[PDB]
Design a protein around this ligand. Structure first.
Ligand code: AP5
Ligand code: MG
Ligand code: NA
Length: 214
């Protein structure tokens, strides 16, 4: 199974990705996670993203296309994968088409703009795994600690309010058009498309997605 997650910043894509990965045993391909990891490790492919992400801007198409192409060539992607943050622009989507990368589901996470800032400012992450928490809405069992590894959670450098607002502008300017893109693909029978209410509690969004994915 191959899946794309669409939605504004903070819509809950990464949170729900964890559950989908487990049930269907496919890896999460998170371009945000991959870019942050490249910056942290000083990897030649992706370290350039540091200043761009801090500015709340999109990394160039060619860089993230290269990162994704490298990542889905791995053997753990041979029987399916979950795309989380990719594609993020029309050219990124067309690059997938050009490469002949078909998907089975495109899942849109709907959340009002007014909820995004207070979600992201409370976000805490376990970088090695991609797991994320919220200090109020979805906290760890032990404050500041990853539930699975017990390792110390961190705060992303680009998660302050002003940077979030810039990300939201970028989204509406560049990324929202992917709804129509994959809605059109679905009408052609090239994939299924489904929209969920991302304001529901985490477990209910999970249940709604499970009902769609069967
Ligand atoms: N293809 C690409 N092309 C170009 N540039 C790219 C790129 N991909 C990345 N980049 C670059 O990387 C930068 C950062 O991008 P990115 O890594 O994607 O961060 P983002 O834009 O802020 O949005 P996320 O996808 O991380 O949020 P999410 O939808 O996964 O929600 P989450 O589960 O975390 O949840 C949010 C919070 O709410 C909580 N939460 C989750 N679900 C619920 C719920 N139902 N109820 C209450 N709280 C919830 C969570 O605990 C969490 O705290 C970009 O600006 C860009 O520079
Ligand atoms: Mg994500
Ligand atoms: Na398909």
């Amino acid at each position: 199974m191959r899946i794309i997650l669409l939605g504004a910043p903070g819509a809950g894509k990464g949170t729900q990705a964890q559950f989908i990965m487990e049930k269907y045993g496919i890896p999460q391909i998170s371009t945000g996670d991959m870019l942050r990891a490249a910056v942290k490790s000083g990897s030649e492919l992706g370290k350039q993203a540091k200043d761009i992400m801090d500015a709340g801007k999109l990394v160039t198409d060619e860089l993230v296309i290269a990162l994704v192409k490298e990542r889905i060539a791995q053997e753990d992607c041979r029987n399916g994968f979950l795309l989380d943050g990719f594609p993020r622009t029309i050219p990124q989507a067309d690059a997938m088409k050009e490469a002949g990368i078909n998907v089975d589901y495109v899942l849109e996470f709907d959340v009002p703009d007014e909820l995004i800032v207070d979600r992201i400012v409370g976000r805490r992450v376990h970088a090695p795994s991609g797991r994320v928490y919220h200090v109020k809405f979805n906290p760890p069992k032990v404050e500041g600690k990853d539930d699975v590894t017990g390792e110390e959670l961190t705060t992303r450098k680009d998660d302050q309010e002003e940077t979030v607002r810039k990300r939201l502008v970028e989204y509406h300017q560049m990324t929202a058009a992917l709804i129509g893109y994959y809605s059109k693909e679905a009408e052609a029978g090239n994939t299924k498309y489904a929209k969920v209410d991302g304001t529901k509690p985490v477990a209910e969004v999970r249940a709604d997605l499970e009902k769609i994915l069967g």
